[PDB]
């Protein structure tokens, strides 16, 4: 089971059944991995910003996207499905915030 540096774990070969049995990590480890991935994503965005790659505004937007899209961006919810509540809350915030923020200004 090889770890990407983005924390998305997945298998090298197709595992024989014994191997699979041995190597089913559970709800702890996966959760941890997810958390790490999230961290990387926020940290990655800041790194990008620091590097000339992306504007401050862009960085901010990226961060916002990450925080709202945790749900899509990376499976935490899979492993612990009360993160679903958090996701929902984030979505709600986005809905509220976006409507406040894009009043006279248009969709984008």
């Amino acid at each position: 089971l090889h770890l990407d540096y983005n924390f998305n774990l997945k298998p090298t070969k197709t595992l024989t059944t014994k191997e699979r049995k041995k190597s089913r990590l559970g709800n702890s480890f996966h959760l941890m991995r997810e958390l790490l991935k999230m961290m990387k994503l926020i940290v990655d965005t800041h790194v990008q910003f620091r590097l000339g790659n992306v504007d401050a505004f862009q960085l901010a937007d990226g961060i916002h996207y990450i925080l709202n899209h945790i749900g899509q961006l990376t499976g935490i919810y899979r492993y612990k499905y009360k993160v679903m509540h958090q996701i929902r809350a984030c979505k709600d915030l986005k809905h509220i915030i976006y409507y406040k923020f894009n009043k006279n200004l248009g969709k984008g």
Binding site: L1, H2, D4, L9, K10, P11, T12, K13, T14, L15, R20, S23, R24, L25
Partner: protein, 114 residues
């Protein structure tokens, strides 16, 4: 790590075509894949007697057989197979063929149907 795994990890340099070619090159050398009598799990439809030790293996009894392709097909473009079995008691190689003209099987120097 989980049977429904979407994407298997590949190295950062994995020219898929090239990889395939390489595999092919190392398939003639390979032990398994370059052989006949590839394994299979099957229940026995015929319900027959093992000719050596007379062990009455009944219908639907499960075995780890060997399926092999018979080169001489039925008619033209519909294959037929030899399906090896062992008797439980004595280790005599029973087998049978699947001639699809009658929608049924044929015994092949293993046992007799009854």
């Amino acid at each position: 790590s989980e049977r429904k795994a979407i994407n298997k990890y590949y190295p950062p340099d994995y020219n898929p075509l090239e990889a395939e070619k390489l595999s092919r090159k190392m398939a003639k050398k390979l032990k398994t894949m370059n052989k006949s009598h590839a394994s299979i799990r099957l229940m026995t439809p015929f319900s027959m007697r093992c000719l050596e030790c007379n062990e009455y293996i009944p219908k639907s009894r499960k075995f780890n057989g060997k399926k092999e392709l018979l080169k001489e097909k039925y008619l033209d473009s519909i294959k037929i197979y030899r399906l090896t079995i062992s008797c439980p008691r004595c280790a005599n190689s029973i087998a049978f063929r699947t001639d699809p003209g009658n929608s049924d099987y044929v015994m092949e120097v293993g046992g007799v149907r009854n």
